[PDB]
Symmetry: D2
């Protein structure tokens, strides 16, 4: 088990995920399943015990002739019996004729794919843990930094940057719970034979299935699921849900990185953004990866139409989309991880953007305050008419408020500036942040 | 309702849940509950709460004016708020929609609509599971040919095939209850999610509003965090994918040349028997899987209100609920009255004249000759049986060692497809045991 | 219709084309043409063709009865056929539908509906094109900052940016004309495509029916060959793709911090002092639904044998939605482009954000002769990076290099640092799209 | 370099067009053509052009360093440009990439790659079309049961069925020819489309470079205007849809219970049980499904913002090579199957006779229409079909027991009306209509 990369293979993928879904790890998973099967069937008394040992001793990927395997896969049409043929030829005294006993190739591919998935989700759980940790730090560190919230790409009312990070944090917490829920279904053995009923094992296939299952630390199956692809498809839809949030994160960050906005920046790495333009390339890659995974999810839903006891086409969609969606997702997870660990935050630009409306962004605040001293009704009417006068003449809301003599007589400039200061109107952002950090 | 296909690719129950009238009805329950909460906590006068709840009535809406207002405003709530304020007397409606924003209403109405919609789905699923529970038992020992790559494989039972659908639909039930924790959640955060205008009362209004509607309180605002809605969509995709397989298998078994099952007999629904339910299931599943991709796409809502992605949900979630209901409805109907033809399954088992159970002949003959040597020898007789279109039994008897070790009475039984059923019944037991 | 959002994610003209009523109107138009065609050829009695045509009128259909019958029969034609026979006198009912199968009518109806729909699309495209031709010429010399990866790149003009949309919509117009001559095609082949019940009159009927309906005669039956319908789907995907970009760029220029364009001013079009880009919002959501719709229609192409068992029916649902969603997007884009507010002052303000850094490239070339092309590069590069860290004009830092200050005077220098002086051949490129 | 499935869901020829090496080779041909154009226009010195063209060779690329620079820079051109400058002598490499931005190179190379890919696709289509012309003629008179909703309908001929594919593939050929004139277009516009750095020589450079590369000059820059690439994607979706139908039909006709066709015989190509397996059909199906979702991602990619997209443009980097490779494998399999398709007329005949004459009840109604009434014969034959099907008896036998039927038509005449081989309509005329251009 040792170590193939093109120009972009580590841009839209990761080295780790590529290895999990490599031909070598796949065939290794195959050989692990075959070895465990032999051992299981030996204890049960189905196959000789000396044969099991010899099989296990040749269940090693390093002994695989790859060019021969490729050719035999293309001729046979499926990717297992080529490995079986070599396993049989590698065993001495014909003891290889006891491997693959009662198994069909989709038993090996489905169970391999579950093993590869479990390895894959270990990396995703790690990426998620780190992303969550960064968001926890970011929510606290930036708990009290004011900025303009945006609705339909227009300024709404002030919030804090840590508030925005708390909302991402709550989402990734949900994704984590979704992940652990699907694991109990997905981490399941597939061993049913040609038709799912293990006809060639007699009264023994279900003892074999139950023993093979926890030999490989997998849940026993209720019943065969060769054309019941809901375990594989829900992994795909989870990847779609997770990358969706990654894509929102990328959208918000690249939007806050605009020359005209300048409120955040990806972590500085010398000459990475390609004067000094630092393009949000991590956001760029996340976006493209999310787009490809969401369509790959639709392909895996499509794949669930596998007919009868082996799909004539739909099953084979999983061979292609699953590795790709894993690799794309890991690239997006890697990039968001990197961005959130060293994210630059520019409070002075957030402050400058808050001051663009010259107090109109806190029109409500002024109203609320002036209410007790002027009257709910006059407060509404006066602020609304003052806010609209400031809009047409490009003036501070304060300056127009001060031309209302009843307002000027009731409040001194100093009180009115605190009402006209966007930084004084954050509602309960910090208490909301606290509610997310609390668990 | 009146459209020709409105009940073919939809259903009346689901269509009314997502109708303009039930949506505005959900809006009005929310605004009334909000006024009750804010009166009890002292934010608005209690005479306004009473006046507002009594005018939170869908019957009072001028729909033509509402529509014209929504097309002007751009979003679907403040048109209802405008009618609620004008309907109140001396100006007590000025205290409705107090500190809320339109998406608080649309999001939370959609949760309520989703909960109504999932009650129907849960209800259809229950019916489908028991139909499969009885079918698995009823046809437990009905032999038939399993098929791989649309070629005959080895014999199974029709109940075994039904137990596999049964296990699958149960997992979908588990996924339904699982997402319900996340989805049944209040959305109340205001313009930017922090309830700025409610001051130190914003969180209290949210929390007490939540239990007013029997909804979980949200960790934090989720106006552009659409993973609850998108997750429902991908569940409908997963569900309609299994319905699509069922429709695929039934319509394949409904072929003139196969004739092993048939959709329930109705009148002149097809001398015919067209699998039109399978047809509708298929078209529904295809549209749902694509809509699910649209819902993932919609998760990219920017900042605190999406500039486009959010609106994708306004269109896709009703369609996908309606499409799924139509597909669940048809699968419920077909499974409840499914016709099963054991004589056709038997005729198809005999097509190969024994080759479909060459594996059984190998096993039985392995005891006296050896697993490896019997495998090769029987495979060599399968050479002669197929090329000369003979029964395998006849060719097996022309081999010396096989005839010398096994007699004709015993070869006819290894060559009977009805005897090579494996442990099918134990597998239906394992699925029917829980 | 009358739904709150039915004219927001759709339009009246498109809803009508795909309405049950216009669909059935198409059905009866086809059945009347068929009876007449078969009277001329002698297949049916001329008294039958006359009586049938007199009753091919959408006003006479029992809509509730047609609905229940379609739900029982399973397909949407024989319910209308049954009422046509009951409405004719002296049993003249079916000499109609003579040798036709239901999908002959649906397919041919859908083709007439697509032609009506594409009549709308070609009109909106013509208006969009004219607005863009006007905007490209109007704002031919309006400088603004181009943007790459959402960061400013080098100056362009706003009319140059509109010319690039214009060139795109012209390509979409060509695509539309190209597919029309494939799509406007008759479907008349009967149950299995060979019109076996018409004997030696099948091709004769088909070719006469095609001329009657102003459609091309089919090479052969295409009941399970959905490429004509699917390529309409993919064209709606392509076209809405461009509309979606237009929506993305306009809403991006509408941000509070950018403010370079705005949707046409209308009333309270959502209250807080102010106007959200809802046209952009609707275009985006319609594009998203159309592009997935085109994938379902590619999926539909897998209709088995001589009538698909599911794939065909996907078209019943997807095609009308995609036509309606697209018309909603085209209406909004038409509206936005006809009265688009453009703010050259905000464009100039954003050009001046970097205080000359945006045209550092021009400073290098301009300083090349007096310094040396490579000292110019190295010196402007380092002066630019000092100018950013201190938030000062590039000019001022350039004048703090004594070698530079000795070679050129300040007049020459904030001509080269003036972003408006570095616009390239934007105007000549605009011309190429207008075609002078 | 090839993995286990690299030639199963892909092809060597297409994998090679989209490889790193062919892509970088296109980059270098464009850089060479650029220096040659600008040397003639006097924009760069001719000695530099000669030195730049001499080093525009893929063989001189350090691939590991190119990877490292691309991961750092973010985009895949300037790593090749860096090596081209350094490989040139006397600092003459500073005149390459003159006025270009990376997307000019990636877009134009992608165009060159697409043209090479459509050369393969056109060769596959010609072969598929030729195979179908032969099959439509050879099986012009082979009768079989047509199928609607997977139920037998009325009789047709297998050559009629193949003529229907043939007409479809000719329409795809027309679509390909139509998009090529739009797609085969130069991209050369600089950072923002206006070639600001080239001044009054930008348009002059663009048009000379275009004809140097045998590409149409562009109306205007199209860096974020991806309709040419998305159009290629949707065409692949249309084409693989037809291939997917062909695969669905052939695999349905390959069922154990149907047995009407079979994929070409290759010793042990079907995993086996003495058994075959429609593996070619299996692969076409999965390829069409992946191509069709990619078409959606290419449409999604059209939302590139302003003058260089922040994300959407990069979708094309991944989707286009994959969709092309997937399509090439579907075309490879479809070409192979159609060249050696096995047709079993005896099975088609056996399946026709299953209904015992019901499949041609329509023909009996017409025949008996003349002497009894077109409407009356229909209802009368239709009532007879109930007894034949409820009793599992031949339609002929029940017809001979209907008294006015037997009075008006003899056995010998009802033989012919009940023979499914006599109700084929104008299948041969329709085949002729397709084969005739």
């Amino acid at each position: 088990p040792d170590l193939s990369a093109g120009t972009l293979s580590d841009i839209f993928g990761t080295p780790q995920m590529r290895e999990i879904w490599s031909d070598q790890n796949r065939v290794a998973c195959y050989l692990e399943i075959e070895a465990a099967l032999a051992i299981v069937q030996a204890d049960l008394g189905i196959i000789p015990k000396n044969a099991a040992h010899e099989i296990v001793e040749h269940c090693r990927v390093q002994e695989i002739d790859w060019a021969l395997y490729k050719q035999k896969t293309e001729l046979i049409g499926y990717p297992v019996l080529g490995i079986v043929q070599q396993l049989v030829a590698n065993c001495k005294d014909g003891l290889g004729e006891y491997c693959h006993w009662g198994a069909t190739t989709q038993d090996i591919t489905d169970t391999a794919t579950v093993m590869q998935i479990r390895q894959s989700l270990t990396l995703v759980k790690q990426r998620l843990d780190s992303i969550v940790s960064s968001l926890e730090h970011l929510a606290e560190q930036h708990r009290n930094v004011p900025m303009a919230a945006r609705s339909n790409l227009k300024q709404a009312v002030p919030i804090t940057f840590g508030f925005k990070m708390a909302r991402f944090l709550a989402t990734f917490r949900r994704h984590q719970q979704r992940l652990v829920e699907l694991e109990k279904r997905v981490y399941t053995l597939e061993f049913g034979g040609a038709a799912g009923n293990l006809s060639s094992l007699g009264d023994q296939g279900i003892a074999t299935h139950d023993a093979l299952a926890k030999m490989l630390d997998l849940a026993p199956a209720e019943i065969a699921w060769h054309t019941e692809h809901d375990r594989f498809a829900e992994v795909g839809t989870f990847l779609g849900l997770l990358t969706g949030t990654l894509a929102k994160l990328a959208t918000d960050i690249k939007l806050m990185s605009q020359t005209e906005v300048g409120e955040v920046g990806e972590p500085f790495i010398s000459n990475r953004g390609s004067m000094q333009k630092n393009n949000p390339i991590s956001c760029v890659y996340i976006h493209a990866c999310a787009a490809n995974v969401r369509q790959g999810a639709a392909a895996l839903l499509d794949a669930m139409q596998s007919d009868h006891e082996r799909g004539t086409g739909p099953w084979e969609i999983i061979w292609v989309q699953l590795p790709l969606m894993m690799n794309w997702t890991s690239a997006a997870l890697n990039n968001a991880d990197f961005v959130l660990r060293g994210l630059q935050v520019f409070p002075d630009a957030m402050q400058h953007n808050l001051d663009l409306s010259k107090g109109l962004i806190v029109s409500e605040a002024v109203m609320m305050g002036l209410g007790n001293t002027l009257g709910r009704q006059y407060a509404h009417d006066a602020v609304y008419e003052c806010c609209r006068t400031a809009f047409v003449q490009d003036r501070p809301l304060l300056d127009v408020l001060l031309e209302n003599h009843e307002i000027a007589s009731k409040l001194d400039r100093t009180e009115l500036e605190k009402l006209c200061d966007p930084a004084n109107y954050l509602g309960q952002c910090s208490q909301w942040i606290d509610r997310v950090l609390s668990p």
